[PDB]
Design a protein around this ligand. Structure first.
Ligand code: ADP
Ligand code: ADP
Ligand code: ADP
Ligand code: ADP
Ligand code: RGP
Ligand code: RGP
Ligand code: RGP
Ligand code: RGP
Ligand code: MG
Ligand code: MG
Ligand code: MG
Ligand code: MG
Lengths: 15, 270, 270, 270, 270, 15, 15, 15
């Protein structure tokens, strides 16, 4: 969850 | 047809300006239908032997929409809690100009019309050679059946709205008509909201200048200034709503619509 | 990896220039494949944390193609016997800039990249305020992950090629690398045609300047001048063929390809 | 709000059909403004939580325009004296479908909406498995916030208009509303030209079927047939002019506009 | 020029197939440069008096990319922790076909070429009338200097790859050459990875069929099957890498590149 | 024929 | 924060 | 002139 809360939306797009 | 619009029978070169309230719609996105109908009307005019010149606007807003999207795409959820910084205006215009030009080119290709982009700054107009060369280039482009689309280069400026730029080009190019497409049906003696303000049909500098009570880029005060400038200079000025594209054809058909600015209206005063 | 290209490990902001021999192909039409591969490489670089700046060219040629088509469409058969007059150059650039910008915007949208158009004239660079404000705007756009695409506004000029403009922007913006994409594999001691000319890998101002024998906008003499300017100024310069898009990644990977212009090459002299 | 349109408060899945008299304008070219306003309205509806399905048309006409242009471009002046042969219809549809799909995709990308193209022939509807699988696929696409755009594959047919296809899909997909965008304000008891024909607001199969006197793909007889089919089946049907895009929002707001086909109108008979 | 490719001097109607490994590049996005060079080559061939037919592919992948983007745009952060469901394939193809067709139309308009979209399912080929009518329509389109672009309608199928569809169309249309653009330089006696596999130049059904050891839509086994089918049928088959667009011109120039499938190779056996 | 020899290609496009 | 953690990216785009 | 009267518009486009 920490990683997600510190990701940029674009990052979520890339595996 | 009233003689107040008798000049509509011999108008050959016209200048059309579209404000940001016309090109951009909800949420800062492009008003597809409105802007598309305007382009259809312009292509129809160009086919019938008219040489038109379009001064558009809407670069800043589109730019802002796109840049905000990019910011949100790149942001990190932990950053959507704190408030975001307010975007750079010149970058916004730089993006919006490219987007608007691509969109215009797409639908003018769809209508089988060739268009050219001319971005001019205020500082460039201080040279006589620049004005002469611009007149030559625009004359050549108009002779080649191409619609010039001007604007102010905001991305590179070091700072006079498009309305004033429109008047300038119409006077420098000796155009026969200047049309200002706004979001309102025309000039009003007061705010359009109240019922105590009526629709003008002919502007009289001596009379009509005092009783107008404007509200608190440039709003309508600027528009009026630019129009009066163009008129005095020699080019009639017409203000009409850009929400209905058929307003252009009706204006060119002599139909009495919109607000007019003619120096000869002193004699044509009813 | 030779130490002559050791700077490729810390290059962050780069400037890429594409000549007209790269953007335009047969018949003055757009080189779709070449230009598309270049854009793919640029988008890949932008994703990996680089801030790139593209100075393109090809406006004049595309414009000419389109305007010639329009002339032929409007001509009357009785006019195809007599010879046609030669098109206006500034109108040509005005049309070509819009077409090129729309095309660039289309495929950068396809690659999910936001781009902005900045057209700057020579006369605008005589103000210190202009340079400061341009640096601020470009810094903001690069921080917002947007690729600026510059060029010279030919449509409005009153006349320094893009090569010189590239060098200027790279020195004013303190970029870490300047890449000149040409149609040849790189600088040569003579004409590329003969077999007596070999491929340089490092340019030495003291040595290599005399024996070069160039042929009879700006060709390669101008390119060399601009490169040496940028180098002396502080920004390394790389010249490589734009026909293979993977040349960009190879250059950024430290691979020894193309011609280099570094002031430190005096110490790095082999 | 009259209770005759009380169903407009719970309509969730709707089907919108645009006729060739709406998509195509003068000279067989695309009606940019009209079609753009329709797309803007559809995107606005899609944002507000509606799942819409568009069945369009205009492939044949656009195709014909483009193919005629190509024929004229390739013709030899000595061939413009003799009369040209009349173009193949299926080739015309094949070109027009691609052009229309590209144009739709362009402006739905502009409005930030994803669209999908589904071309279905009459012969494919004779399999139960096909209908089940189509329902599953369309349900998935609607759940994914994507607007399906159907049509008949004319390019490959071996031959039921879009109106009938619309009714079919609306009944197979259990849509809550079927809107038929035509060029007229709605159904009429006679030809719209004369002043002896008045505007219907609710269609009664028992009563209103006899006194209607239609003139001499499918015109309005077909439209009425398809509408009555959809109604009987269970899906209300609304016929309204496609010239004003705000008609869609007004219909979805419960405003009494257009012609309605409800089986419950027997009880709602005034 | 070896006599094994002597047929290249009289080939007039050709069929070109592009696999998904050619049209789609990194991340499921469109391979702009590769696909653009292919289109440039096809337009050049079309200008020189050839009638080409393109069977493309890449709908499913593009569709998937776009739909994934839409899912991520609509998702709620609380949903990015749990694993997302796997997308519907037919919806994916439905979106991808539209996107690919729009992209193809854009750059074929850029190259001044008219294209048409033909989507055909397997179930439609069970009627003799369908084949006759398809041959007539394709003949008319080819005579009108238009490039047909076929594919399988996946969005509506109830399920034979494009390779097999290519062979089918090439045999039904009596084309003079069938080119299969793959990601590899051609057929190999084994996997391309190891150094023990060499490049074939002519395929012999009697000899070469046994020693080939393929690995574990359709891969290369299917490709070979389809090629042998087309050959036996009468239409030579050429397999070559689609990464270099000049391979097409080299093949049409008689240069010995790629893998060939000719029934006459029994006599032309070296 | 005179009309044709004095038409502009665009004109041929319009009836 | 709860609202954000329960918003869809698109929602963040609209004020 | 004969050549012109027997050319296709496209041909005129190419030198
Ligand atoms: N006296 C007036 N008559 C008409 N409109 C006025 C008046 N005073 C203010 N306005 C307002 O000015 C607006 C148009 O100015 P502006 O917004 O600058 O045009 P645009 O931005 O579209 O170029 C109108 O929407 C109108 O409400
Ligand atoms: N000494 C040299 N070494 C390499 N190329 C040279 C030399 N002298 C002249 N050239 C020519 O200059 C050309 C590149 O200059 P230019 O045409 O101005 O680039 P572009 O127009 O693509 O920006 C090359 O095609 C090359 O043949
Ligand atoms: N009784 C009627 N009421 C209304 N319209 C009618 C009637 N009879 C014929 N029409 C004509 O039918 C036309 C609409 O049918 P059609 O052309 O098939 O729609 P589209 O082609 O736009 O799908 C209208 O333009 C209208 O003039
Ligand atoms: N004997 C073989 N010779 C060549 N390629 C082979 C062989 N066996 C398997 N392949 C593989 O098959 C692939 C091409 O098949 P395929 O992926 O179906 O093409 P596409 O998907 O591009 O249409 C090549 O990448 C190649 O590595
Ligand atoms: N740069 C231009 C400025 C135009 C302008 O300020 O005038 P207006 O938007 O009031 O017509 C733009 O915003 O698009
Ligand atoms: N106006 C620009 C000039 C660019 C220029 O002259 O430099 P080059 O075309 O040699 O790279 C154009 O032609 O596109
Ligand atoms: N192939 C479709 C047929 C559609 C059709 O015939 O119905 P209509 O054009 O009357 O709405 C087209 O013409 O675009
Ligand atoms: N629907 C088509 C299927 C094509 C296909 O499976 O063949 P291949 O992708 O192996 O060339 C697509 O995926 O684009
Ligand atoms: Mg203003
Ligand atoms: Mg040069
Ligand atoms: Mg009908
Ligand atoms: Mg396969």
């Amino acid at each position: 969850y920490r990683q997600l809360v510190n990701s940029s939306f674009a990052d979520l797009q890339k595996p």
